[PDB]
Design a protein around this ligand. Structure first.
Ligand code: 1PR
Ligand code: NI
Length: 532
């Protein structure tokens, strides 16, 4: 309470706050959560952090509803250090197009807009860099990567950058595709980042430490060889080749949690993080909702794993042990507050998509995809697709969209579509992958986890045509999954397809290769990867 520096963190009791708290404590500070304006006074606060997550309006409304506007302004007026993270940075602006009627602190007199999806996938999900500048601050290093996860940003042009310049603002810029936007801002005692430092590994922890210690250390003295290797070449729109490590979570005979048919999933996640994983996905496949074992795994993993965590399995409307009807939104909220950054929807995604087409290509606003994305944004919803190839002689043989394949079927069929399955692949549905992804994308999904039942655990590579087929269908990031066995497979997916990321389960779990082994190979072949 006074034996270490206290850091006040504003808590609107929504989203993942575990990572930020753990990151601050890991730096040797004590965290004091401020859920109400009554929980903190100006003179008794030396370090204030305004963490934001989800939909702009859902955050700003909640924040101002609690009466935080004046306290925040009075704190900023006191001249003491404040750090805004994600929506914490967006709140400094006039508002956002994500929530038209919502307002902002208006320190920067313009609104955040949506990235152009005509040239790249929106939301931006991945590791981007700050463009080299003379006015960088708090240790922001152009040769390092930070994690961005957003659809809206403060998009720049000459006029805006100049007004901000003359206004006394220091701007850390970043580019996604052909669009330049604000990655971070700094003026007097105000600091804010569009990226999540608590999710950016060591590079991220350094940014937090630099703010808490109020220092702008010089960037390491890199050689012309190191710079040329670490610089952003703007391949894959400026995002590094994202390597995702995934693990299954099952319950054995005794009731304990294991990854092979509650410390094992936790320790493996820590290992994956220590060995270079850009993301860790937990597939829950294992009792009251509050006491769910998977929630505790997230909590434990979130203590040392400073990269985004995804959880999938059973995210839908449920009937708890006591009979209480808990909507999918509340289930996802529980997982988020427990350490998860994104939730994966499989079975309920196929249902929602079928319903979508029956209603004449519209949603009724009740599906997990719709409610979760409206509260936490599209970047918080992942669709887990579990497809299988079905051959046909022509488009006339099915209502589902087909494509011409390079690999003829058993009877010489030159066309095929991919059929969706539910409940761990135990049941098929008369819905194609083309129809499923497009539907879910419309309902609000922000990313597609594209598995392939035929390639699952085969270590023979990814289903390249499937990847390209889905990339033709949607404008949201698509993750290549199922089939990864060797580093060459990742390279193949990244060069021969438009895959926005690569996921691996078996190969990492077998210790055959580590995430770093895959990264070393990609780096050796000229691809950009996160190395921290
Ligand atoms: N009983 C199961 O086996 C099972 N049950 C659920 N899942 C996954 O979890 C998601 C969420 O489940 P909901 O239906 O939403 O409750 C599903 O969509 C599904 O992908 C299951 N298995 C996972 N199936 C495929 C993968 O996603 C796999 O992790 C990669 O193919 C790894 O491949 P690799 O070893 O080749 O690297
Ligand atoms: Ni103390």
């Amino acid at each position: 309470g006074s034996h270490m520096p206290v850091v006040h963190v504003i808590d609107v009791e929504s989203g993942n706050l575990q990572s930020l708290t753990n990151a601050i404590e890991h730096l040797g500070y004590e965290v004091q959560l401020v859920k109400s304006p009554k929980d903190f006074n100006i003179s008794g606060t030396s370090r204030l952090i305004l963490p934001g997550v989800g939909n702009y309006g859902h955050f700003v409304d909640n924040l101002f509803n609690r009466g935080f506007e004046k306290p925040i302004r009075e704190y900023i007026e006191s001249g003491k250090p404040i750090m805004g993270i994600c929506v914490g940075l967006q709140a400094l602006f006039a508002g956002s197009v994500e929530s038209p009627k919502s307002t902002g602190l208006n320190y920067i007199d313009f609104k955040l807009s949506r990235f152009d999806d005509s040239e790249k996938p929106v939301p931006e999900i991945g590791w981007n860099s700050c463009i080299p500048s003379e006015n960088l601050f708090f240790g922001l290093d152009p040769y390092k990567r930070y994690y961005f996860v957003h659809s809206f940003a403060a998009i720049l042009n000459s006029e805006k950058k100049k007004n901000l310049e003359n206004d006394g603002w220091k701007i850390a810029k970043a580019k996604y595709g052909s669009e330049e936007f604000i990655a971070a801002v700094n003026k007097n005692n105000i600091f804010a980042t569009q990226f999540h430092p608590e999710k950016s590994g060591k590079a991220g922890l350094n940014v937090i430490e630099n703010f808490l210690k109020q220092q702008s250390p010089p960037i390491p003295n890199y050689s012309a060889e190191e710079k040329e290797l670490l610089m952003n070449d703007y391949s894959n729109y400026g995002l590094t080749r994202r390597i995702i490590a995934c693990l299954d979570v099952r319950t054995n005979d005794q009731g304990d949690l294991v990854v092979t048919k509650l410390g094992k999933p936790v320790q493996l996640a820590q290992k994956y993080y220590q060995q270079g994983a850009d993301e860790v996905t937990f597939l829950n496949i294992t009792c009251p909702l509050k006491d769910t074992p998977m929630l505790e795994v997230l909590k434990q993993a979130a203590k040392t794993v400073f990269v985004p965590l995804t959880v999938g399995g059973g995210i839908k409307d449920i009937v708890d042990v006591d009979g209480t009807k808990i909507p999918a939104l509340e289930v996802a909220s529980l997982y988020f507050r427990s350490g998860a950054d994104k939730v994966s929807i499989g079975t309920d995604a196929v249902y929602a998509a079928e319903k979508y087409y029956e209603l004449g290509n519209r949603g009724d606003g009740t599906s997990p995809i719709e409610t979760i994305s409206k509260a936490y944004g599209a970047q918080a919803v992942v669709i887990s697709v579990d497809p299988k190839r079905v051959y046909v002689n022509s488009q006339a043989d099915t209502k589902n969209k087909v494509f011409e394949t390079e690999y003829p079927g058993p009877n010489g069929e030159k066309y095929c579509w991919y059929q969706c399955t539910i409940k761990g692949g135990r049941e098929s549905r008369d819905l194609g992958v083309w129809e499923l992804t497009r539907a879910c994308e419309a309902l609000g999904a922000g990313e597609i986890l594209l598995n392939c039942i035929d390639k699952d655990g085969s270590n023979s590579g990814y289903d390249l045509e499937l990847i390209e087929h889905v990339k033709d269908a949607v404008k949201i990031p698509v993750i290549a999954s199922s089939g990864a066995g060797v580093p060459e497979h990742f390279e193949e997916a990244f060069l021969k397809t438009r895959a926005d990321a690569c996921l691996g389960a078996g190969m990492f779990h077998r210790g055959e290769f580590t995430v770093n082994d895959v990264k070393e190979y990609l780096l050796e072949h000229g691809l950009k990867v996160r190395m921290d």
